[PDB]
Design a protein around this ligand. Structure first.
Ligand code: HEA
Ligand code: HEA
Ligand SMILES: CCCCCCCCCCCCCCCC(=O)OC[C@H](COP(=O)([O-])OCC[N+](C)(C)C)OC(=O)CCCCCCCCCCCCCCC
Ligand SMILES: CCCCCCCCCCCCCCCC(=O)OC[C@H](COP(=O)(O)OCCN)OC(=O)CCCCCCCCCCCCCCC
Ligand SMILES: CCCCCCCCCCCCCCCC(=O)OC[C@H](COP(=O)(O)OCCN)OC(=O)CCCCCCCCCCCCCCC
Ligand SMILES: CCCCCCCCCCCCCCCC(=O)OC[C@H](COP(=O)(O)OCCN)OC(=O)CCCCCCCCCCCCCCC
Ligand SMILES: CCCCCCCCCCCCCCCC(=O)OC[C@H](COP(=O)(O)OCCN)OC(=O)CCCCCCCCCCCCCCC
Ligand SMILES: CCCCCCCCCCCCCCCC(=O)OC[C@H](COP(=O)(O)OCCN)OC(=O)CCCCCCCCCCCCCCC
Ligand SMILES: CCCCCCCCCCCCCCCC(=O)OC[C@H](COP(=O)(O)OCCN)OC(=O)CCCCCCCCCCCCCCC
Ligand SMILES: [Ca+2]
Ligand SMILES: [Cu+2]
Ligand SMILES: [Mg+2]
Lengths: 534, 102, 45, 55, 133, 59, 47
């Protein structure tokens, strides 16, 4: 068993390893989020005895952990490496040793991030690593270097997996599959791979310039030397907004599939969904300077960037309305992936509308570095990535594990994370619009009420997570029992309203995707003969 | 291209006449009723004939039960099941509501 | 044609419950912090 | 006989669309004409009293 | 085709006892009913018709719904137990916390209101920070 | 030297892992394994002094 | 290459044939995942 997991070269074992590291680091990011929200419950130093440096360190640990080590490994790595060779009928993805080195370069990024947290002071620079705060004059010690190396190792992983995904879905399709006949999750991870490939160079450039300023006495960003800190903001946000579209677009893939398979009707205008995802992917790279409306850009530059940022509301609206058109007129079977899809729809529309109010450069005067932007981004990130992750897990885990999960516990877990995430991220808009600044361990004591109700919501969210990792244990030890009693949902699609039960039993899986006719846990090398398609 | 109503009627008459076993009768009936129109009573008459020809009772009850869940009023269901009174009397299928009286 | 009651009647009888139920559901989903401020001490009660 | 009954979902979709736009317009008409107009009336009343005490 | 009729001992009340009938008796009843199908359907008795309808479209097996009759109450009671347990844990780890700020008093916040009223801050909104006891 | 046909025969007719199939494989593989073990043991070993504060003495 | 496949051969860990309980390893994994930031907070506050 040393070979199959350490020396691994098939995509599914790499995928479950990606998912395991993703959920380990997501547990750690949730713990850091709990500690942040615990310290931010009441004014005055409650738990961290003073020590705003430790609070900032936990802020970058929580942020970089939940982005680069939970959502990106889970969504990209685990779901891509399981379904992207499967949903196109490929045997095993091209360059599987690149597919193995990307996974195995991730958890040492986790190791050096943890040791950045442990060494002399910790990186307390925010998740954006802005100079001269992250330079050597404000942050001495080797900590921000190790956080930079964590970002470099996960940048290597994201780029190499992106190359692997592009040539897998281009070169290794099955024989009947034209590019137009592809699924939406495969198209989604294709477009995400292209945005990774075209974004991570600028991140690597800006981060290595930061490292060169820190340790080799050069001045890309040091004012004493002629350097300009706004260059790092330009480089980091040319990575950064393509990055957040990278995080959201696999959710746009998963939600199309769970919505079409739990409404029992196909996606409304699927080629328009391909065009809308590609339009969002092209339009990301042109809007990157909405994150810096404050630095003193020209009025024509901001008047451009608010229009460019607003233009992306149109294709995301086309996607969010075609999902409503898929759910309209169908026969809804409200299992937990359908619950996570509906909640994704509503709460991502709310986060996107707060983002549209954030797109205006005259209003981002009033909202920059307030808790309004953390309302916006925790809405789109939390719902549109965690609900997408939970929908993907409860959707594909009976198939890729052979073990059905408890359904009543799944719906109480959904409901608890629904109301808990709402209770934590709704008063952030109130704190922001009343002028509470960002990244503070303490506040004026007029913010204590909404900080209290959000800190009450955090315990609900952590209880739903503890319940979810109980659902994992209950799935792993009693999955076959869950199939044989009535504690789960065996059939994702019920019979239609004419169909007999034996006529159903001869044809028990009716999907437009390959993965559900594969055997529970699938063959170690399936597709001996290639999967034919008309 | 969109089909007019009589073109739909001709197509599903031909389909129900060509259906040859129980999987085909239930398939033709499933995508017969999954449009935005209650089918014409000639189509339902051909559906009951085709369910009789494959010797299966309960799909011929499901014709009327799907017609009940498909039609928009409670009066058009009456207009349908009194215009199919002689066909349902000849085959001898019940409605589901007079089969399970509650 | 037009067998039965009109589409106005038979869809208003479905919609008029759903308007009130939607208003209740959204007023809970959006106006829940009003209860916390209502029971709170900053209303001086 | 039975007249052809077709297209219930189209009438249902346009009825749901205009009911949703009118419901959201009722929400936003309350938002503007109550809340924003109330705040603007309070501010204009304060600046009227301020100019009066400046006289 | 087949014999006279399915007996009432073997076909009556088939809804209550389909899911407890063993698979062999299920298969034998299904076989005899499929042989009874080819007769002209006036000659079927009423428990036979109910058995055939429940076998093909009854709420068993594949037509079993997602939540079976007690699960909605169980998920409501579960989410209520989660809310009460989580605010109990919040009360516990809040009780193991640091001291309050010295400015979290009714009398301190009244003097803050007094200072703000002397500066006439927040003139058409609220300026009073009281919020505490 | 055109060892391609002979190495095709050796490489395809072998129940060994692919990095071991050449006759000169141990000649690379043993010192690489020792040097790799040293090079991944030592910087992990210097982490307690990093998190303790003890910089390296300049001697 | 030909590995074993089936219900529990898809995963790295060992659930069924096991000396210790599975709940030990399954909750110790998530427990050290949840307690990594407490180790970080303890080290930084001791400093
Ligand atoms: C991935 C994106 C992501 C997600 C999901 C979250 C989720 C949460 N975050 Fe955070 N956060 C950020 C990304 C995210 N955050 C970023 C980028 C910053 C910026 C830092 C800066 O500005 O400097 C930030 C900062 C930030 C702040 C602002 C603090 C400040 O700057 O002053 C707060 C405030 O409470 C917070 C807390 C929380 C809490 C309580 C959750 C809760 O939602 C936790 C509940 C979530 C779960 C329980 C997830 C489920 C767990 C899993 C492991 C998924 C399992 C599913 C599968 C494996 C399929 N984090
Ligand atoms: C999940 C990833 C994600 C997604 C998808 C988005 C989506 C959007 N974001 Fe956001 N954003 C972040 C992650 C994301 N963001 C992060 C992490 C930050 C903080 C970074 C930091 O500070 O470090 C941030 C901050 C951020 C800023 C910077 C503000 C500041 O720092 O001062 C801005 C400014 O324009 C912005 C706007 C938008 C807009 C317009 C969209 C749009 O794409 C949303 C599109 C969706 C809709 C528009 C709704 C659906 C459409 C309809 C229902 C149709 C009807 C709608 C209309 C007619 C408008 N967000
Ligand atoms: C398990 C049962 C445990 C019961 C404990 C009983 C003690 C108690 O009533 O606690 C009240 C808590 C105290 O919380 P606090 O007011 O923030 O005080 C924290 C302690 N200091 C900072 C002073 C050191 O105050 C609260 O936590 C308020 C409760 C949370 C609000 C719930 C509202 C529910 C609305 C529906
Ligand atoms: C920086 C990353 C550089 C990526 C180059 C990839 C080239 C395209 C490709 O795919 O090259 C193919 C090989 C992988 O092929 P394989 O054996 O998996 O394929 C089997 C079927 N032929 O790439 C490599 O050997 C990359 C080697 C990386 C060396 C360490 C880099 C660390 C930094
Ligand atoms: C601005 C308005 C749009 C906003 C966005 C839409 C809302 C999002 C949710 C959509 C859910 C339903 C989608 C699936 C339906 C479907 O797919 O229907 C498919 C049918 C097919 O018709 P056919 O067989 O004749 O043609 C077959 C060949 N095409 O086409 C329709 O029904 C037509 C519906 C027309 C809608 C007109 C809207 C009029 C109101 C505009 C706003 C007025 C505001 C007034 C305020 C006082
Ligand atoms: C949705 C269900 C969960 C929401 C959690 C709400 C947190 C309560 C809170 O935030 O409690 C803060 C308030 C004000 O208390 P205070 O300002 O005196 O706090 C000083 C220190 N305690 O307590 C309450 O009014 C409890 C009643 C809230 C009713 C909520 C009902 C929602 C429906
Ligand atoms: C959208 C509608 C949201 C309603 C929330 C109910 C608040 C209940 C409450 O708790 O409101 C309490 C306050 C009263 O407080 P006071 O100032 O009188 O306190 C004085 C103490 N001495 O009500 C209000 O100020 C009115 C609130 C109006 C809503 C403004 C919303 C603007 C920000 C939008 C947030 C993001 C929206 C998401 C995208 C649409
Ligand atoms: C705090 C802010 C958020 C507040 C949220 C609302 C407050 C309530 C919290 C939840 C209480 C638990 C109730 C459990 C219900 C139950 O038990 O469901 C059981 C029901 C009925 O079952 P049955 O008819 O088959 O028969 C059972 C009896 N034999 O099935 C369902 O699941 C369907 C109902 C859920 C619909 C999907 C909702 C998905 C999320 C939507 C997100 C918002 C979109 C809408 C926005 C306007
Ligand atoms: C931790 C305590 C271990 C105690 C062992 C005692 C040994 C005595 C003998 C007992 C029997 C043998 C035990 C060894 C076997 C073992 O347990 O697997 C050992 C491994 C690590 O082992 P290690 O290298 O840390 O062990 C040191 C000694 N060799 O655990 C784990 O991966 C735990 C993993 C947690 C489960 C994760 C659940 C989530 C999975 C999601 C998958 C689905 C993905 C779907 C989406 C793609
Ligand atoms: Ca605090
Ligand atoms: Cu952005
Ligand atoms: Mg800023």
């Amino acid at each position: 068993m040393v070979q199959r997991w350490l020396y691994s070269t098939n995509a599914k074992d790499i995928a479950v390893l990606y998912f395991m590291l993703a959920i380990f680091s997501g547990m750690a990011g949730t713990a850091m989020s709990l500690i942040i929200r615990l310290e931010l419950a009441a004014p005055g130093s409650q738990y961290l005895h003073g020590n705003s440096q430790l609070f900032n360190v936990l802020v970058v640990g929580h942020a970089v952990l939940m982005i680069f080590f939970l959502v990106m490994p889970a969504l990209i790595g685990g779901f891509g490496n399981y379904l992207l060779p499967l949903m196109i009928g490929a045997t095993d993805t091209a360059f599987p040793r690149i597919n193995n080195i990307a996974f195995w370069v991730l958890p040492m990024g986790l190791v050096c991030l943890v040791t950045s947290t442990l060494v002399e002071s910790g990186a307390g620079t925010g998740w954006t690593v802005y100079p001269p705060l992250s330079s050597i004059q404000a942050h001495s010690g080797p900590s921000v270097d190790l956080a930079i190396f964590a970002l470099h190792l996960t940048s290597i992983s994201s780029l190499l997996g992106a190359i692997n995904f592009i040539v897998t879905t281009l070169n290794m399709r099955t024989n009947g599959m034209t590019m137009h006949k592809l699924p939406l999750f495969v198209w989604s991870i294709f477009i995400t791979a292209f945005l990774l490939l075209l974004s991570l160079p600028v991140l690597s450039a800006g981060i290595t310039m930061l490292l060169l300023d820190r340790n080799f006495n050069t001045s890309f960003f040091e004012v004493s030397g002629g350097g300009d800190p706004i260059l790092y903001e330009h480089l980091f946000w040319f990575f950064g907004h393509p990055e957040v579209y990278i995080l959201i677009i696999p959710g746009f893939g998963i939600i199309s599939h769970v919505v079409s398979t739990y409404s029992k009707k196909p996606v409304f205008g699927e080629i328009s969904m391909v065009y809308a995802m590609a339009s969002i992917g092209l339009l990301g790279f042109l809007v990157w300077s909405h994150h810096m409306y404050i630095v003193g850009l020209d009025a024509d530059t901001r008047a451009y960037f608010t229009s460019a940022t607003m233009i992306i509301a149109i294709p995301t609206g086309i996607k969010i309305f075609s999902w409503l058109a898929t759910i309209h007129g169908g026969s809804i079977r409200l299992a937990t992936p359908m619950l996570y899809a509906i909640a994704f729809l509503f709460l991502f529309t709310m986060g996107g509308l707060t983002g549209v109010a954030l797109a205006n450069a005259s209003l981002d005067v009033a909202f920059h570095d307030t808790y309004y932007v953390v309302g916006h981004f925790h809405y789109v990130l939390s719902m549109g990535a965690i609900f997408s992750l939970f929908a993907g897990y409860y959707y594909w885990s009976p198939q890729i594990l052979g073990l059905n999960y408890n359904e009543k516990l799944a719906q109480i877990q959904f409901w608890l994370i629904f109301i808990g995430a709402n209770v934590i991220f709704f008063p952030m808009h109130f704190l922001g619009i009343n002028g509470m600044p960002r990244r503070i361990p303490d506040y004026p004591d007029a913010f204590a009420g909404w900080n209290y109700v959000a800190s009450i919501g955090s315990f609900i969210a952590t209880l739903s997570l503890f319940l979810f990792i109980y659902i994992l244990y209950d799935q792993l030890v009693n999955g076959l029992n869950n199939k044989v009693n009535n504690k789960s949902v065996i059939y994702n699609k019920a019979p239609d309203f004419v169909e007999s039960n034996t006529i159903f039993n001869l044809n028990t899986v009716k999907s437009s995707s390959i993965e559900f006719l594969l055997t529970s846990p699938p063959a170690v090398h399936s597709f001996n003969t290639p999967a034919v398609q008309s | 291209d969109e089909e007019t109503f009589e073109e739909f009627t001709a197509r599903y008459e031909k389909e129900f006449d060509e259906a040859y076993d129980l999987f085909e009768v239930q398939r033709v009936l499933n995508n017969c009723f999954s449009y935005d129109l209650v089918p014409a009573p000639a189509v339902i008459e051909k559906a009951l004939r085709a369910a009789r020809r494959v010797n299966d009772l309960p799909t011929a009850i499901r014709v009327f039960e799907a017609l009940k869940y498909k039609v928009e009023n409670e009066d058009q269901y009456k207009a349908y099941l009194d215009e199919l009174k002689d066909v349902r009397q000849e085959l001898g299928v019940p409605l589901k509501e007079e089969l399970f009286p509650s | 044609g037009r067998i039965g009651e009109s589409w106005v009647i038979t869809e208003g009888r479905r919609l008029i419950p759903e308007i009130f139920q939607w208003s209740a559901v959204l007023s809970v989903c959006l106006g829940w912090p009003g209860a916390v401020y209502f029971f709170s001490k900053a209303r001086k009660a | 006989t039975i007249a052809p009954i077709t297209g219930t979902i189209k009438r249902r979709v346009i009825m749901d669309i205009v009911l949703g736009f009118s419901l959201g317009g009722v929400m936003a008409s309350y938002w503007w004409w109550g809340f924003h107009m109330d705040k603007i009336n309070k501010r204009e009343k304060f600046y009227a009293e301020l100019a009066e005490r400046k006289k | 085709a087949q014999t006279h009729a399915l007996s009432n001992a073997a076909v009556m009340d088939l809804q209550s006892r389909w899911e407890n009938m063993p698979s062999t008796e299920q298969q034998d009843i299904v076989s005899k009913l499929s042989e009874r199908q080819k007769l002209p359907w006036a000659q079927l008795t009423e428990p036979e018709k109910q058995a055939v309808w429940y076998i093909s479209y009854g709420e068993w097996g594949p037509r079993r719904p997602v939540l079976n009759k007690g699960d909605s109450s169980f998920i409501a009671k579960g989410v209520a137990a989660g809310l009460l347990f989580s605010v109990g844990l919040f009360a516990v780890v809040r009780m193991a916390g640091g001291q309050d700020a010295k400015t979290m008093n009714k009398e301190w916040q009244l003097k803050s209101d007094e200072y703000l009223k002397s500066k006439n801050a927040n003139p058409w909104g609220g300026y009073s920070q009281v919020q505490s006891k | 030297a055109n060892k391609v046909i002979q190495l095709q025969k050796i490489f395809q007719s072998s129940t060994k892992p692919l990095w071991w199939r050449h006759p000169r494989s141990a000649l690379y593989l043993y010192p690489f394994y020792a040097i790799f073990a040293v090079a991944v043991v030592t910087p992990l070993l210097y982490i307690p002094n990093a998190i303790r504060g003890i910089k390296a003495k300049k001697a | 290459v030909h590995f074993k496949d089936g219900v529990y051969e898809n995963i790295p860990f060992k659930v069924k044939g096991r000396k210790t309980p599975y709940a030990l390893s399954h909750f110790g994994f998530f427990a050290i995942g949840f307690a990594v930031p407490f180790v970080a907070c303890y080290v930084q506050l001791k400093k």
